[PDB]
Amino acid sequence: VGIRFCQECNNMLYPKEDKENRILLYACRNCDYQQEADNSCIYVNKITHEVDELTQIIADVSQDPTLPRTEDHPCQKCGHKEAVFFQSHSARAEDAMRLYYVCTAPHCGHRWTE
Amino acid sequence: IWGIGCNP
Amino acid sequence: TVINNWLLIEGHTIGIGDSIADSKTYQDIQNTIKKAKQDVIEVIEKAHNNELEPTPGNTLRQTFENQVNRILNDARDKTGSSAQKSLSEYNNFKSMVVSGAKGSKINISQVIAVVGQQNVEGKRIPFGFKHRTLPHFIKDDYGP
Amino acid sequence: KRHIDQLKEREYNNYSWQDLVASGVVEYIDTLEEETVMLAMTPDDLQEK
Ligand SMILES: [Zn+2]
Ligand SMILES: [Zn+2]
């Protein structure tokens, strides 16, 4: 999944298999450093790309004047009544009109979707 | 100026 | 020639008296608009809860726009029909529409009841600003 | 009301649009900044609760 950069040359490590030991080794082409791979997964592609946008949402968006705010939905973490609510705001979000609520009030920074 | 099926 | 010389005796005109309707008709038009706005709000709330089910061959955004446009168009047409009921025999807008000389039922409806939905490129007014049509509206407002 | 009272006697008070801008009552906003601004068409109607 994640890309590892070699310490010796600070370049990308590409996967390589040692036939003798049948052990996966991440080895740079430029330098001879080789590292055993713990993850054992080379390439992962999510065609559905069903990735939650809750992680992507920034808590800073609560400060926006233009965002609608509801006091109807209380915050789960701290119970603050106000919460700005906005839709996906994302391209390639397929067809979702879910509201991604963000709790207002300083430093709570809680994002929940109902 | 009327609707979506009419005119603008 | 003959009809134009009779029209000197009878005469034709267009005035504000023709545009104005009965108070009952205005109240009916307003009630239709109120309930239409409430219906659009219910559709929006269904979409936000994800209760809306996509129409076959359409995305959820497309089917939401379809249902919202249907509600607004039905309200528009119903208000137009109420306005057209209000017209008297003497109404001159009706004289011209009935004779076919100029105008249409649509024009009478827009004059008296409701201008209707403004569509650009086949869709409702787009989000020219970031996620809002005009700076006065709140972001992500799909209301009427 | 004090601002409009000063503007009303614009003659012999030397209070003008520049004074209004300097006071902080009004501001110039371009479209890019308009995207970040919530506007009220009519003050009394939209500001009032
Ligand atoms: Zn290296
Ligand atoms: Zn909170």
UniProtKB/TrEMBL annotation, chain C:
Cellular compartments annotated: Chromosome; Cytoplasm; Nucleus
Q: Which family does it belong to?
A: Belongs to the RNA polymerase beta' chain family.
Biological function: DNA-dependent RNA polymerase catalyzes the transcription of DNA into RNA using the four ribonucleoside triphosphates as substrates.
Supply the name of the protein: DNA-directed RNA polymerase subunit
Q: Which organism is it from?
A: Sus scrofa (Pig)
Lineage of source species: Eukaryota, Metazoa, Chordata, Craniata, Vertebrata
Q: Which residues of the full protein are shown?
A: 674 to 817 of 1970
Automatic annotation (TrEMBL), chain D:
Localization, per the record, is:
Nucleus
Q: Where is the RNA polymerase Rpb2 domain?
A: 17-49
> From which domain of life does this come?
Eukaryota
Known role = RNA-dependent RNA polymerase that catalyzes the extension of a non-coding RNA (ncRNA) at the 3'-end using the four ribonucleoside triphosphates as substrates. An internal ncRNA sequence near the 3'-end serves as a template in a single-round Pol II-mediated RNA polymerization reaction. May decrease the stability of ncRNAs that repress Pol II-mediated gene transcription. DNA-dependent RNA polymerase catalyzes the transcription of DNA into RNA using the four ribonucleoside triphosphates as substrates.
Family statement: Belongs to the RNA polymerase beta chain family.
This chain belongs to the protein called DNA-directed RNA polymerase subunit beta
